[PDB]
């Protein structure tokens, strides 16, 4: 199974808690999400940051399984995730797609943006419905940063987090880029803090 | 054309065939 | 419908056509032998292949 | 009103099996349902089912694997003679190599191919395949 080192470390806990990844969607609750944990009063549902960690680690293991690093495609059309998938593209193969999807990228090879990935990772499944719809046409697994109310249709392993926060969306991409750099052996020390600041994957308003 | 008035027209002719026949029996 | 007309043109075209007589030809094998004649002409010979295998 | 209990039990299984669910709750769990399920279970079509005992009629929770295509009940229970069994098997089975017509006979409830071995016939209950 696991070497018992992959368990949630105390230092990563406040990072998830500071980034407000625990506070998810409001009373609206898709039945496909049992990730909720003791919904807070004032109409706020607290995602189990515990359960997020295993899914985040499990998604990282799937990413590392891809032989060619360029066969992973990171999709983010939401305004809060263009920079995050760009850095994710720098540290791994991870050919990115930020902005408009150019529908048909997974079909009609005559397109200038023809992509044939082995695995796609989407930031917001609702805002990337077109991105995952064409994945289901060409036999492609999908990983999503699913909220507690997202349309999980045609969505494989999905990390429950908060998509209403600038840091929460940015931090998850930073985390998701960490173990894939640890499983691949890029980072020699498993317990290394990796003092490279998580502010790299953060959107700037100017 | 209208089926409403062909129903009405036939009913008015139902009266006639019923009244002309009473002259015999 | 109207029943009257003109019977004076009955068989009008049958009479006007010219009379042409049966061109004499050697008689054709009848029975099993004709099966040979049909077999060889259309499954061995490919002569009548004008554009679409047109035999006529 | 509720005419055949076996029809509802066999109906709930089909809808549950069609949608991929691995379990189904059956009400109100008559004996013929128990005997019918043991015939499906003997061939590996269902697997595990447990009889919940409330004091009125009982309920069944059946564990479903993707090994069942369709299970049916034939209404009414037509009388079937030995020579007439083969006609039933040809009408409502996809092949001659798999699938069983489940028919109640005098010597208990049993499927069609094993009722031939005992050389006994009776009324038809349903089918499984």
């Amino acid at each position: 199974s696991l070497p018992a080192t992959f368990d949630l470390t105390p230092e990563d806990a406040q990072l998830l808690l500071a980034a407000n990844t625990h506070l998810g969607a409001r009373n609206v609750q898709v039945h496909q999400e049992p990730y909720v944990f003791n919904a807070r009063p004032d109409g706020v549902h607290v995602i189990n940051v515990g359960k997020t960690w295993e899914k985040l680690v499990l998604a990282a293991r799937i990413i590392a399984a891809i032989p060619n690093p360029e066969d992973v495609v990171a999709i983010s059309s939401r305004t809060f995730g263009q920079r995050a998938v760009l850095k994710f593209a720098a540290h791994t193969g991870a050919t990115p797609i930020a902005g408009r999807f150019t529908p048909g990228s997974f079909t009609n090879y005559i397109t200038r943006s023809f992509k044939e990935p082995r695995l796609v990772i989407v930031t917001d499944p609702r805002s990337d419905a077109q991105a995952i719809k064409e994945a289901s046409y060409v036999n492609i697994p999908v990983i999503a940063l699913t909220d507690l109310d997202s349309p999980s249709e045609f969505v494989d392993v999905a990390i429950p987090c908060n998509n209403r926060g600038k840091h929460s969306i940015g931090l998850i991409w930073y985390l998701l880029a960490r173990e894939v750099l640890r499983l691949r052996g890029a980072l020699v020390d498993r317990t290394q803090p990796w003092s490279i600041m998580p502010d790299l994957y953060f959107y700037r308003d100017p | 054309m209208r089926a409403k008035w062909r129903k009405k027209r036939t009913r008015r002719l139902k009266r006639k065939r019923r009244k002309v026949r009473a002259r015999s029996k | 419908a109207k029943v009257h007309g003109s019977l004076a043109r009955a068989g009008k075209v049958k009479s006007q056509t010219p009379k042409v007589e049966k061109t004499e030809k050697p008689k054709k094998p009848k029975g099993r032998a004709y099966k040979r004649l049909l077999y060889t002409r259309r499954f061995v010979n490919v002569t009548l292949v004008n554009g679409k295998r047109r035999m006529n | 009103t509720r005419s055949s209990v076996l029809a509802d039990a066999l109906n709930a299984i089909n809808n549950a099996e069609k949608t991929g669910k691995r379990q189904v709750l059956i009400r109100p769990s008559s004996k013929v349902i128990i005997k019918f399920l043991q015939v499906m279970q003997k061939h590996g079509y269902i697997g595990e089912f447990e009889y919940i005992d409330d004091h009125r009629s009982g309920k069944i929770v059946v564990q479903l694997n993707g090994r069942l295509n369709k299970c049916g009940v034939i209404s009414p229970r037509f009388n079937v003679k030995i020579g007439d069994i083969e006609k039933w098997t040809a009408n409502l089975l996809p092949a001659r190599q798999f699938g069983y017509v489940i028919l109640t006979t005098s010597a208990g409830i049993m499927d069609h191919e094993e009722a031939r071995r005992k050389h006994v016939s009776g009324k038809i209950l349903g089918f499984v395949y």
């Binding site: - | - | 029943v3 009257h4 068989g11 | 229970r77």
Partner: protein, 96 residues
């Protein structure tokens, strides 16, 4: 339940209900009613003999322009008048 009764003791309802809906068929109703015997000037037979009474120049229905060269024949066994076609190219000359 799809309409029809399905009980094992409901053969009378199914047997009777079929008969009443048999009459909707044109052929079944015509055969049982015996309209061919009481109408259709033949006696229900394939051919019938008659006597040519006049010659006719019946027109043709649109779109068509022709004279159909029929004859008015009176059947022998019945005495009814029917119109008979003389099918060939100009054989009305043989039916004087």
């Amino acid at each position: 339940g799809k309409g029809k009764p399905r009980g094992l003791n409901s053969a009378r309802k199914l047997r009777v209900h079929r008969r009443n809906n048999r009459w909707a068929e044109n052929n079944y109703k015509k055969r049982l009613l015996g309209t061919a015997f009481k109408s259709s000037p033949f006696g229900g037979s394939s051919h019938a003999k008659g006597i040519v009474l006049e010659k006719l120049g019946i027109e043709s229905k649109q779109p068509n322009s022709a004279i159909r060269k029929c004859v008015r024949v009176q059947l022998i066994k019945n005495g009814k008048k029917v119109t008979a076609f003389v099918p060939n190219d100009g054989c009305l000359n043989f039916v004087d």
